[PDB]
Amino acid sequence: DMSGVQNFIYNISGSKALKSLRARSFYLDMLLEYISDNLLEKLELSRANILYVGGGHAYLLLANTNKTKAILSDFEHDLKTWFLDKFKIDLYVAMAYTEVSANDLMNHNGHYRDIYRRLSQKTSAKKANRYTAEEILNLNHQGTENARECRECKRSDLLIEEDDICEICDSLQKVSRDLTRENIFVIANEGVLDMPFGKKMSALSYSQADKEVQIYAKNISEIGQNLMTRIDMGDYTYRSDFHEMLEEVEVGINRLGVLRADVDNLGQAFINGIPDDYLSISRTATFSRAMSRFFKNYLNQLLAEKSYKINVIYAGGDDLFMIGAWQDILDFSIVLKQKFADFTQNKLSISAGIGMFREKYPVARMASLTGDLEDAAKDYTKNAVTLFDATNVFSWDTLENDIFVKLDAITKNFEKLDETGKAFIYRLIDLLRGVNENQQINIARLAYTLSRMEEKIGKTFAQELYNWANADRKTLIMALEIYILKTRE
Amino acid sequence: MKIIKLYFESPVHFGEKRLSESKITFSADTLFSALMIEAVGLGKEDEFYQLASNNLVKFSDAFPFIDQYYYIPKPMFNLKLFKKLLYVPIDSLEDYLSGGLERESFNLGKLALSEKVQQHDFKDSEPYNVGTFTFKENTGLYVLIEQTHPLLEELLENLQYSGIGGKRNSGYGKFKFEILEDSDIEDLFSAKGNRKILLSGALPKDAELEQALKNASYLLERRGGFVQSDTYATNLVKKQDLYVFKSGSTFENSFDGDIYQVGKKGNHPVYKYAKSFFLEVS
Amino acid sequence: MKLVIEGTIVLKTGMHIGGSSDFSAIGAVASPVVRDTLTRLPLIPGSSLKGKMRYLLAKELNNGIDQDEILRLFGSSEKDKIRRARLKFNDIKLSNLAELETFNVSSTEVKFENTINRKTAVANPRQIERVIAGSKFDFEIFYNLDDIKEVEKDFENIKQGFDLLEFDYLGGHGTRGSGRIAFENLSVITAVGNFEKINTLNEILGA
Amino acid sequence: MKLVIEGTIVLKTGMHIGGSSDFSAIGAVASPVVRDTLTRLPLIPGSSLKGKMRYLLAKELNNGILLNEPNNDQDEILRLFGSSEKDKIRRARLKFNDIKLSNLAELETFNVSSTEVKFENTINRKTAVANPRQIERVIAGSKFDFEIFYNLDDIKEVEKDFENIKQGFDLLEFDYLGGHGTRGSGRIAFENLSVITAVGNFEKINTLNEILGA
Amino acid sequence: MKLVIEGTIVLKTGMHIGGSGAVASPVVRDTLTRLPLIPGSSLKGKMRYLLAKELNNGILLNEPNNDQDEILRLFGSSEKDKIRRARLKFNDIKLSNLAELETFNVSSTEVKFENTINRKTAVANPRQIERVIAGSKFDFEIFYNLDDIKEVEKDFENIKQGFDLLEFDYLGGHGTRGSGRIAFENLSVITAVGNFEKINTLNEILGA
């Protein structure tokens, strides 16, 4: 159970911190992959003993022997020491285990929920008492005084002598420069990205992989002879540089759009979503594999189908984070909800939050307040989307049906075009917001105003627009807002 | 035991590693450093450190308050059987612990971001951005003290017209303070209990750390930064990183911390208040 | 040994300081002004007032050659020169909004400007939010008194910065109309520490 | 050290600057002038006056045409009105202020409003019918007391700069200020043109005040 | 370089410009001094109509943006590409000779009474028309800015053509029914700042 993963990915202080988010998310995911695979190597177990290696956590089934517990204690101590010696408090892996039996696995006497209940209890107990006394003493003993600090990750240890930059953070910069749509990843003694246990990772492609080594590929070419392990993540990037892809779009405002979503109640549907009479270890395995398979593989293929201007930072049910052109974020959110509902047969709900920002907005504040619009959507954990602000909370069906037929109608009949007709559009938007400040003298003014503004657009007003503008609908002002945001310089 | 309610008249900035990011409240390190700077302004830092080291003044981290309701961080209890909850009121802790008990929403204000530039005459100007936090109209922060001293009040009044937090000379941080001795909070603090909740960013000394970590649910917090003075080392320099427990932590054994020295290679010492402040519950 | 200088910034012409990107209302094609985030009322940042006073004071001084008057009044952090600033500026919010509600008028306006191309004789309009003229901003700036032998020269420089700013603008498109201010009710009261010559500062700033 | 040039823009004919289609139900009058939002006075913006002086001065230093970008003006125009290039960026020596109507008392003395409405046709040569249009204008004879801040940073250029400033005012004497000026309106004239110093007396202020008051 | 063309508009008959107390159909006046006024829009529009109709093959039916190059360069344009700045610059013209009119002990304007005798009724339904009186004079000046040395001769020929075209037509109001007849006199051209080389030829092709 890796802790502080969002704090590792989004809390980076760089001016060019947007180019390293995929590198940091990749680093954490493949870090957990290699840690689990290394433990399975130490226990002489196959990779079939991974039930789920996911975003931030892994689950292993392994034998209840004293030799196994000895290897587990040594592995936990070495992993803890390596994580302290690189990421002081900012990253922690909690290795907790419980004793389960075969009648307990088979749900013969109940207790199959109790496996993961005991495991979550022991993992939270390990997270509560994170360190020992000696580790805290060595943390406080290594503090020095120095007049230097990294630009991005802002630590003063492991700085390079030639430039004020943390070594691991610079290695993330290098691998961000060397991450493509086809790069496989190789872990060996020499490499770019520092890893346990005395190994480093290069992210090299492709003929340099003729090299002792473990090779991690997103997609495998040949199964048998080529002999590498297939590890998938939601690594869709459109252009891997935000200024150029923001300069590519030309119709709307030049703002960056952030989508943060999660499935509603992973934990509840994961421990007590299945009925008790159908519980099995294989059914938990196939549910976890189905959800991860959807998010990673299917989200990559839907994004590559219609080439959206979207960079994916994190993919998974528990947390999702994509960023790109805000028009393509708004276009892909509805099709993400639709295809998730097609995958899960409407048995699971997804709550999203959109946010629009400049490119030079701070990335940590960006992710943090996109997450606070996320929890504003989760207040309403239902079908809910917050469109760029915490007060503009909709549902998915309202957004889909009402907002898109309203936007299509507005883009149809508002494309006359006219020059002062746009001034009329902003005028009516501002006074609809003025009566949205809840004064009915303003709606008396608007009753006077409709008599002024029948003839400005012509006769296309009094078929659908007047029925939407009956009593200051929030749907109409949001559709007009996204229309005038989609139509600028 | 007394209170120091801080009613703010301005946006604050209480950054953690940033200028662009801020938190809703500050800690005992920052208030001790601010009072020490106001003591060296009026030449009483030898008296103030001798008061603070001998436990004549003992103040917690600053904590939120909305209308007649004093808040503390959600204590990390290691109970067996509200993840978005972060602050539970201090009086409601007994019936928060006795069952799964949400009565009213917690709203203090909201964060902001100021957009500023560094203007140049014959060059393109440099944008930068300061993350702030504006309190609501009848909210603020409070600090718990006991056995108050006239030096503490003099230093607080001097800090009142100087600023708390970061970017204080550039528009932020002004407040007013009031003592307002309460009866319910002091009766809540005088009562003993089997389990004690930490309330300041403390770190036990090296001969009591093992005793402190017995049945403990803690969270370490890196508390460092740059030295703010003029007479230290004739250039900007980062103090020693000190990892203290976070203020919401909860312990079985008691301890008293220390005012650790994080600056040694300079003309004057630099101190870090990691003394312990506890609240007993059952 | 810690002083308070109180006053009011009235606006002879409108003012366009700053801009929020908080999605408050960025739909309207008009560059917005900085406002308080919980009242949404117009705001003069303390950094803007501080920086424009520093700019005009460091340009009126330092001619033909910054000097230690500017650094001791506004703070500095160089490789060898580090000084604490003596002035503590605060963010200034709108004062006479009840007086602005007697006239049934908003706290802020919008100003239209074209740009006539000389080649093609065509205008593209643009809009600017301005806080209107007749707005008043009650400010207080805190001075701490490290040395009595420099306080009178410091206050002479502060009044020099104030009337130098009264012959310039405060942020935004000031060459093309806006930004003009006028400082009034400038007075000094000591906050903590009784200062024996306070009336001389009250007359060198209140003149 | 900074100089102030104060004068008066008197309207020889009507003048129509500016307009926002106000949300109040004013009735059956359209196209209002830009007004001061608090004191309800009609206003001459400093942006309009600055742009028209810059165009007429850049046009006057001519032989040939004026067709360029404002940043690629003549170097005297760039040193008077400012330029913003990537490297050759010059601070503007002039600071304009928004000018509001001064002699409201004198317009009230003759018992007449501060702004009026002029009705105006456009007869289409096919149909020969007229469509009347209300254009709100400011009454001629209204006076607008302006002040422009001149910051002086080179003594060896101030005489040429004030020569160019007086030439720009003279070029506005034979052109219009804002609005439908070719159809009659907009004609202005500059009166009481004088220069004073903000703080600290300029030694050679007499030649500026005599080539500005010529 | 800029030129000023100055003259006088003397009213041979009555005139009545404009409209919109307790009386019917007032004239458009000065708003401060209450002087009767020729709007420069009206003089420019009537001059543009007559000059565009004479600088054409007889009649004029199209929009003012679609005129000849001489007319469009003399009076301005508004196209998406072919936008031109006007060389003429007309002004509102107030009544000059209140001294001459006040000498004759007559008001500057007077009220004209006239009926509409319906044919099947033979009854009067009278109406009042305010008219500024005949013999009134209107000193004008139009600012001509010089952009082409090789076109000022043709521009001034067209300006004199517009002047003596307006001498044989009326100026605003009920013109065919008696009102509006003007005549131009004291026509001259002067230079604004810095003398033009060929000013004598303009004074003799405009002083004829």
Side-chain angles (χ1 to χ4, degrees), chain A residues 1-14 16-180 182-230 232-333 335-489, chain B residues 1-80 82-282, chain C residues 1-64 66-180 182-188 190-207, chain D residues 1-64 66-187 189-195 197-214, chain E residues 1-58 60-181 183-189 191-208:
Chain A
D1 206 295
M2 293 177 70
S3 296
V5 291
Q6 292 184 2
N7 184 85
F8 185 79
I9 298 157
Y10 306 121
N11 283 111
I12 174 169
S13 311
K16 47 188 283 286
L18 261 177
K19 310 201 106 196
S20 57
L21 305 187
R22 186 154 96 88
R24 292 169 99 82
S25 188
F26 174 72
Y27 186 32
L28 291 192
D29 278 287
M30 186 64 72
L31 191 60
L32 185 75
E33 294 293 328
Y34 186 69
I35 284 161
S36 74
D37 205 298
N38 200 297
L39 177 57
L40 294 185
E41 184 50 63
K42 294 205 190 206
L43 300 169
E44 207 177 4
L45 289 164
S46 43
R47 198 176 169 86
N49 277 87
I50 283 169
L51 282 71
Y52 185 41
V53 64
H57 46 252
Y59 288 87
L60 313 179
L61 177 138
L62 52 81
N64 190 356
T65 79
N66 286 113
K67 173 161 118 172
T68 286
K69 301 199 209 202
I71 299 290
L72 280 182
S73 310
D74 291 331
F75 198 87
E76 175 163 10
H77 179 251
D78 299 359
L79 188 66
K80 208 177 282 176
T81 293
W82 183 88
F83 265 88
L84 271 294
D85 291 331
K86 294 288 188 301
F87 315 100
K88 294 285 183 75
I89 296 299
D90 302 336
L91 271 166
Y92 180 74
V93 184
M95 293 177 70
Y97 69 99
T98 185
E99 307 173 351
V100 308
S101 67
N103 259 335
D104 183 323
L105 277 180
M106 278 172 34
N107 202 46
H108 204 308
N109 41 42
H111 303 339
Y112 185 88
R113 280 83 165 90
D114 268 327
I115 293 170
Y116 296 95
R117 267 206 288 276
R118 285 195 317 274
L119 197 50
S120 169
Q121 176 249 302
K122 288 191 73 163
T123 304
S124 307
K126 199 149 285 292
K127 285 189 188 311
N129 197 285
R130 208 151 295 203
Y131 313 102
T132 35
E134 193 186 320
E135 291 175 349
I136 292 175
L137 287 174
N138 194 26
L139 271 169
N140 293 320
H141 199 85
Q142 290 169 358
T144 63
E145 320 182 10
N146 62 6
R148 272 183 79 202
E149 195 191 6
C150 165
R151 324 187 290 274
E152 308 155 288
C153 74
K154 269 176 171 283
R155 64 190 288 162
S156 278
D157 48 354
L158 314 184
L159 290 179
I160 307 157
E161 293 92 346
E162 66 164 40
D163 192 37
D164 46 357
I165 181 161
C166 61
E167 285 181 355
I168 61 171
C169 311
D170 175 79
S171 72
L172 286 158
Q173 271 192 2
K174 281 174 58 50
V175 68
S176 83
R177 276 198 283 102
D178 206 18
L179 262 177
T180 80
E182 211 265 335
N183 280 8
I184 76 180
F185 321 109
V186 163
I187 287 152
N189 282 310
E190 198 269 333
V192 180
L193 211 57
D194 221 338
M195 276 205 60
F197 291 70
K199 296 290 181 69
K200 281 196 268 293
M201 182 165 75
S202 290
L204 60 83
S205 172
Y206 206 108
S207 289
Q208 298 103 315
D210 186 74
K211 293 144 53 154
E212 191 207 334
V213 296
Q214 304 310 120
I215 298 89
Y216 285 83
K218 206 266 181 192
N219 189 359
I220 192 171
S221 53
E222 307 314 305
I223 292 287
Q225 61 85 30
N226 195 359
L227 191 151
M228 71 186 105
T229 187
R230 190 197 81 82
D232 62 357
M233 72 291 291
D235 67 29
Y236 185 81
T237 178
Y238 172 68
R239 216 190 155 83
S240 69
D241 54 355
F242 291 91
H243 195 211
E244 311 305 314
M245 65 179 288
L246 270 186
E247 283 290 326
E248 278 188 24
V249 63
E250 68 270 37
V251 193
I253 197 179
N254 192 53
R255 296 305 179 85
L256 208 58
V258 188
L259 172 54
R260 215 171 196 275
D262 62 358
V263 185
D264 294 303
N265 321 115
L266 278 300
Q268 297 283 351
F270 183 64
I271 63 170
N272 48 58
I274 302 183
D276 276 25
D277 62 357
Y278 282 156
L279 278 186
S280 175
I281 181 165
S282 48
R283 195 167 264 101
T284 171
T286 194
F287 176 49
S288 306
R289 200 196 98 88
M291 280 294 282
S292 75
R293 169 167 48 80
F294 167 68
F295 269 106
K296 293 143 176 164
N297 209 301
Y298 281 11
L299 196 69
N300 277 7
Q301 266 176 332
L302 281 71
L303 280 159
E305 182 262 334
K306 206 188 292 290
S307 299
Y308 282 109
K309 298 170 195 325
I310 284 167
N311 283 325
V312 186
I313 308 304
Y314 208 89
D318 53 297
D319 272 324
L320 188 147
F321 197 93
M322 323 189 297
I323 176 161
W326 78 277
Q327 302 197 151
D328 283 29
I329 298 297
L330 183 63
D331 286 332
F332 189 75
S333 299
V335 73
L336 160 69
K337 177 249 163 192
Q338 270 290 324
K339 288 280 196 247
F340 181 64
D342 291 331
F343 187 76
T344 58
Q345 294 151 206
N346 274 291
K347 297 291 211 321
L348 290 151
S349 186
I350 180 169
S351 305
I354 322 291
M356 65 180 288
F357 310 91
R358 304 176 289 103
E359 187 199 356
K360 294 300 182 288
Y361 198 78
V363 67
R365 167 157 190 83
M366 206 171 62
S368 80
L369 62 84
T370 304
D372 80 25
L373 276 70
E374 180 64 26
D375 62 56
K378 291 275 274 298
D379 291 332
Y380 202 51
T381 78
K382 265 76 76 176
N383 286 317
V385 180
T386 61
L387 278 297
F388 322 112
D389 202 300
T391 73
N392 205 334
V393 183
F394 290 165
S395 66
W396 274 116
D397 172 42
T398 58
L399 170 62
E400 181 65 26
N401 282 333
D402 292 331
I403 300 299
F404 266 46
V405 299
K406 208 160 284 203
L407 182 71
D408 291 331
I410 281 154
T411 50
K412 181 266 290 180
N413 59 14
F414 271 20
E415 205 262 328
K416 194 188 291 291
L417 60 93
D418 188 75
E419 294 293 328
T420 188
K422 288 165 58 52
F424 293 140
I425 292 160
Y426 290 65
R427 182 180 63 83
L428 62 84
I429 283 163
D430 290 318
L431 269 299
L432 259 61
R433 295 188 73 255
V435 66
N436 210 357
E437 316 307 313
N438 274 313
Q439 40 190 356
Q440 306 320 298
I441 313 303
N442 211 314
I443 207 64
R445 187 269 186 190
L446 279 184
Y448 153 77
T449 300
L450 59 92
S451 67
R452 274 177 43 80
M453 61 79 71
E454 291 101 4
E455 72 271 17
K456 307 304 192 188
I457 205 73
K459 200 58 66 69
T460 180
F461 181 76
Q463 288 88 1
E464 69 275 16
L465 264 289
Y466 184 76
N467 290 318
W468 301 336
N470 44 7
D472 185 66
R473 196 176 304 281
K474 286 191 281 288
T475 310
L476 186 65
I477 62 170
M478 187 66 204
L480 292 172
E481 272 173 356
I482 62 170
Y483 167 71
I484 72 153
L485 265 294
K486 279 172 75 66
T487 54
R488 268 171 177 250
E489 327 187 323
Chain B
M1 169 162 312
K2 280 160 206 172
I3 301 170
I4 317 171
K5 306 180 80 175
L6 317 169
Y7 318 101
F8 289 93
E9 294 293 328
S10 175
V12 297
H13 165 84
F14 295 132
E16 306 91 2
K17 211 150 83 178
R18 300 290 178 88
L19 190 48
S20 53
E21 182 65 26
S22 171
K23 48 188 190 275
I24 73 171
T25 187
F26 61 94
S27 50
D29 297 325
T30 62
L31 188 152
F32 181 74
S33 300
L35 291 188
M36 275 282 318
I37 285 162
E38 294 294 328
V40 303
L42 56 89
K44 290 202 212 199
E45 71 273 15
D46 291 331
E47 189 184 342
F48 183 61
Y49 183 78
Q50 282 273 15
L51 285 187
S53 177
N54 303 324
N55 286 299
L56 277 296
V57 297
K58 198 151 55 52
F59 63 88
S60 57
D61 292 12
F63 294 135
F65 73 94
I66 310 103
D67 293 331
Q68 70 264 11
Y69 278 171
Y70 297 125
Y71 282 62
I72 49 170
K74 191 198 162 48
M76 324 172 50
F77 293 121
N78 219 356
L79 59 86
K80 182 252 184 180
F82 285 148
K83 191 164 72 172
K84 60 181 77 64
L85 191 73
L86 263 170
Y87 289 88
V88 56
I90 187 168
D91 51 45
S92 65
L93 187 46
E94 201 271 330
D95 55 353
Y96 167 84
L97 192 145
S98 78
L101 280 79
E102 66 167 329
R103 274 81 57 185
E104 72 285 332
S105 184
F106 158 75
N107 203 10
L108 200 69
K110 76 163 183 282
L111 297 171
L113 183 86
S114 186
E115 290 272 32
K116 307 188 190 304
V117 77
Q118 188 274 330
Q119 185 265 357
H120 288 292
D121 266 323
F122 321 102
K123 193 167 73 176
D124 47 346
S125 312
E126 292 176 355
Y128 69 101
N129 43 8
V130 178
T132 61
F133 171 86
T134 300
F135 279 84
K136 216 178 300 310
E137 182 65 26
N138 189 359
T139 57
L141 301 185
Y142 77 102
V143 180
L144 295 146
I145 62 170
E146 68 270 46
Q147 49 172 342
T148 197
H149 193 275
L151 181 61
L152 171 68
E153 306 207 41
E154 186 189 8
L155 259 52
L156 277 162
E157 184 178 1
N158 278 259
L159 172 62
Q160 184 178 2
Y161 298 98
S162 188
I164 190 66
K167 289 291 186 198
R168 48 194 203 78
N169 307 311
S170 304
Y172 297 139
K174 74 183 291 297
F175 66 97
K176 305 207 153 297
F177 84 112
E178 180 201 0
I179 291 300
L180 190 149
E181 175 153 32
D182 200 302
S183 305
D184 279 345
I185 308 295
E186 188 161 0
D187 202 6
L188 183 63
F189 263 90
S190 65
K192 300 289 94 175
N194 58 353
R195 195 160 195 79
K196 40 196 80 67
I197 298 171
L198 185 57
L199 283 160
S200 75
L203 172 64
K205 311 191 215 87
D206 305 340
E208 50 182 357
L209 188 62
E210 289 213 338
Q211 168 81 330
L213 304 178
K214 179 63 183 294
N215 286 22
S217 75
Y218 56 89
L219 208 72
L220 261 182
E221 183 178 1
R222 192 203 69 86
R223 291 257 199 91
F226 283 81
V227 184
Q228 170 167 338
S229 77
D230 291 331
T231 56
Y232 197 100
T234 195
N235 73 324
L236 266 59
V237 62
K238 284 180 66 59
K239 65 178 72 66
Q240 271 177 51
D241 267 8
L242 196 72
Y243 298 84
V244 308
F245 294 131
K246 185 177 180 180
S247 55
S249 294
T250 300
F251 291 87
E252 190 195 86
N253 296 340
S254 69
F255 51 91
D256 45 341
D258 197 3
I259 303 165
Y260 297 89
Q261 182 168 359
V262 286
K264 296 172 181 288
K265 298 186 286 293
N267 303 302
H268 71 88
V270 181
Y271 296 117
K272 186 72 81 179
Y273 181 91
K275 289 222 176 271
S276 85
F277 198 73
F278 287 122
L279 161 60
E280 309 284 328
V281 293
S282 294
Chain C
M1 295 298 103
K2 196 163 275 278
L3 272 68
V4 176
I5 62 170
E6 200 191 274
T8 308
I9 308 186
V10 311
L11 282 71
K12 307 328 294 193
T13 310
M15 185 180 288
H16 178 76
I17 294 186
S20 302
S21 293
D22 52 355
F23 183 76
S24 51
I26 51 158
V29 296
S31 54
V33 296
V34 290
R35 329 168 90 100
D36 189 291
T37 61
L38 276 296
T39 59
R40 293 276 104 181
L41 303 177
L43 187 71
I44 283 183
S47 46
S48 287
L49 184 73
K50 174 175 129 152
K52 192 45 161 300
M53 293 177 70
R54 178 173 186 148
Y55 173 74
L56 299 173
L57 210 56
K59 188 163 289 296
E60 177 87 350
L61 306 169
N62 296 295
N63 54 335
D66 283 324
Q67 273 312 286
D68 62 357
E69 269 92 349
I70 305 303
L71 306 182
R72 92 201 184 193
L73 201 53
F74 289 92
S76 66
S77 78
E78 295 291 324
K79 316 302 280 163
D80 213 359
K81 297 180 293 296
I82 298 167
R83 306 198 66 162
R84 296 173 54 212
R86 280 182 191 163
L87 285 167
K88 198 267 185 191
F89 289 81
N90 310 290
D91 273 29
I92 317 158
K93 50 197 180 300
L94 189 66
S95 297
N96 59 341
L97 188 153
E99 185 178 352
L100 263 66
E101 287 293 22
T102 62
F103 288 115
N104 287 56
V105 76
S106 175
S107 311
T108 187
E109 63 182 2
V110 61
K111 169 166 186 186
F112 295 84
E113 307 182 30
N114 288 326
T115 300
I116 310 293
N117 196 11
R118 292 143 188 207
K119 193 68 156 154
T120 69
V122 69
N124 48 359
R126 68 184 173 273
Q127 283 147 80
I128 311 162
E129 272 278 329
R130 299 198 312 182
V131 64
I132 73 184
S135 307
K136 304 169 101 77
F137 290 82
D138 289 334
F139 68 96
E140 58 206 29
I141 300 167
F142 303 134
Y143 180 86
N144 63 333
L145 184 42
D146 296 348
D147 186 74
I148 305 173
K149 286 168 56 59
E150 305 173 21
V151 60
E152 58 94 24
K153 183 57 72 70
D154 280 343
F155 267 92
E156 176 173 347
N157 288 356
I158 293 169
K159 185 58 174 45
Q160 184 64 256
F162 279 148
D163 53 14
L164 268 164
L165 185 46
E166 212 160 1
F167 277 106
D168 207 5
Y169 54 97
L170 188 38
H173 316 88
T175 303
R176 283 82 58 85
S178 66
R180 192 189 191 190
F183 289 85
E184 82 192 343
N185 303 323
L186 284 160
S187 79
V188 183
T190 180
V192 296
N194 210 17
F195 185 33
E196 190 276 331
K197 290 162 59 183
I198 190 67
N199 312 90
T200 175
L201 311 180
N202 213 344
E203 61 86 20
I204 191 167
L205 210 73
Chain D
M1 61 80 71
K2 195 178 276 276
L3 282 64
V4 182
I5 44 173
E6 192 180 89
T8 311
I9 308 184
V10 58
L11 308 180
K12 294 288 177 222
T13 79
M15 173 218 70
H16 175 81
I17 306 191
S20 178
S21 191
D22 52 354
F23 313 130
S24 78
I26 54 181
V29 178
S31 194
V33 290
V34 61
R35 322 201 68 146
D36 194 14
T37 317
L38 189 72
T39 52
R40 286 91 54 206
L41 298 179
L43 184 89
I44 300 179
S47 60
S48 65
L49 178 68
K50 193 186 153 182
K52 200 61 153 153
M53 293 178 70
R54 182 173 185 151
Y55 172 67
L56 292 180
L57 279 175
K59 181 68 174 66
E60 169 80 349
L61 308 170
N62 205 357
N63 49 0
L66 173 75
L67 294 174
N68 45 43
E69 198 83 2
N71 276 334
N72 286 313
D73 272 331
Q74 289 276 351
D75 47 355
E76 304 181 358
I77 308 303
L78 303 177
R79 87 195 184 190
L80 275 174
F81 301 97
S83 80
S84 75
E85 280 207 352
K86 194 69 181 68
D87 190 359
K88 308 182 295 299
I89 177 168
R90 318 196 66 162
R91 199 195 170 196
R93 281 184 203 174
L94 294 162
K95 195 268 190 194
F96 285 76
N97 309 297
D98 279 358
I99 312 102
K100 57 170 73 177
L101 166 62
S102 307
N103 56 338
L104 183 63
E106 195 163 353
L107 302 193
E108 182 65 26
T109 297
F110 291 95
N111 294 104
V112 63
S113 169
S114 66
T115 178
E116 61 88 20
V117 57
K118 179 180 70 67
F119 311 102
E120 190 276 331
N121 279 329
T122 290
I123 48 180
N124 296 114
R125 282 78 176 269
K126 299 288 94 176
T127 78
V129 75
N131 53 3
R133 293 179 293 173
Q134 283 77 14
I135 287 172
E136 196 161 279
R137 300 197 318 181
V138 186
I139 293 92
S142 307
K143 293 201 211 199
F144 286 82
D145 290 322
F146 70 99
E147 40 193 345
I148 307 157
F149 299 139
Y150 178 81
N151 54 88
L152 160 55
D153 45 352
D154 187 33
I155 310 296
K156 295 177 78 67
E157 293 177 17
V158 61
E159 49 92 19
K160 191 70 157 75
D161 280 24
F162 270 80
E163 203 178 297
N164 291 350
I165 282 160
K166 183 56 172 51
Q167 192 159 12
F169 286 146
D170 276 359
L171 290 152
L172 283 177
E173 294 293 328
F174 296 114
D175 181 300
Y176 63 93
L177 186 52
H180 322 86
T182 316
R183 275 171 295 281
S185 300
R187 179 177 184 189
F190 286 89
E191 293 176 353
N192 306 120
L193 278 175
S194 81
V195 64
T197 308
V199 295
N201 277 30
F202 192 30
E203 69 275 16
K204 202 184 284 184
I205 195 76
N206 312 91
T207 188
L208 306 185
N209 213 353
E210 78 174 2
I211 72 176
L212 206 71
Chain E
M1 183 177 324
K2 197 178 278 268
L3 321 176
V4 173
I5 59 171
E6 181 207 59
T8 313
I9 309 175
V10 63
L11 310 186
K12 303 304 293 295
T13 73
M15 199 187 64
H16 159 87
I17 312 287
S20 307
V23 72
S25 81
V27 304
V28 62
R29 319 189 67 131
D30 186 74
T31 317
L32 180 72
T33 48
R34 286 178 180 265
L35 262 64
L37 181 139
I38 293 172
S41 49
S42 47
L43 181 72
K44 183 183 131 163
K46 192 63 149 167
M47 187 173 264
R48 179 162 182 152
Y49 181 76
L50 294 176
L51 195 64
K53 198 181 173 180
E54 182 65 26
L55 270 295
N56 209 34
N57 49 4
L60 166 80
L61 273 298
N62 54 5
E63 309 307 306
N65 274 343
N66 322 307
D67 291 331
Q68 269 92 348
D69 291 331
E70 287 83 4
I71 302 304
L72 262 174
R73 95 194 177 194
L74 205 46
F75 289 89
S77 79
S78 66
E79 272 89 352
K80 280 73 176 175
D81 185 308
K82 294 180 168 186
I83 182 166
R84 310 189 76 168
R85 285 192 154 92
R87 288 190 195 173
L88 292 182
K89 157 57 192 159
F90 288 81
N91 304 297
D92 297 352
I93 309 165
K94 296 183 290 294
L95 187 63
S96 302
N97 49 336
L98 275 178
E100 177 175 345
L101 261 51
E102 198 72 32
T103 306
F104 292 153
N105 300 337
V106 68
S107 179
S108 75
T109 177
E110 61 89 20
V111 54
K112 170 190 174 184
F113 313 99
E114 58 88 21
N115 289 320
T116 302
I117 294 160
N118 191 327
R119 276 82 181 259
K120 63 183 180 179
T121 80
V123 68
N125 55 4
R127 57 179 178 173
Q128 280 62 231
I129 310 183
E130 194 188 24
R131 302 198 320 184
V132 55
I133 77 175
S136 303
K137 296 191 212 196
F138 283 102
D139 285 9
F140 71 101
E141 68 275 16
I142 305 152
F143 307 139
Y144 173 75
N145 53 1
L146 182 43
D147 287 325
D148 291 331
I149 300 282
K150 318 298 281 286
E151 302 181 30
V152 57
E153 305 93 331
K154 190 63 161 82
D155 267 356
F156 264 89
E157 281 182 16
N158 291 351
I159 285 162
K160 184 55 160 40
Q161 190 72 252
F163 280 141
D164 63 358
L165 269 158
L166 264 165
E167 291 174 353
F168 289 114
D169 190 359
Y170 63 91
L171 187 43
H174 317 98
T176 67
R177 218 167 306 121
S179 302
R181 182 184 181 190
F184 285 86
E185 64 175 2
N186 297 326
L187 263 52
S188 76
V189 60
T191 316
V193 174
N195 182 39
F196 192 32
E197 205 264 326
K198 309 190 140 157
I199 188 174
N200 305 323
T201 179
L202 300 187
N203 280 313
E204 64 90 18
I205 71 175
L206 184 143

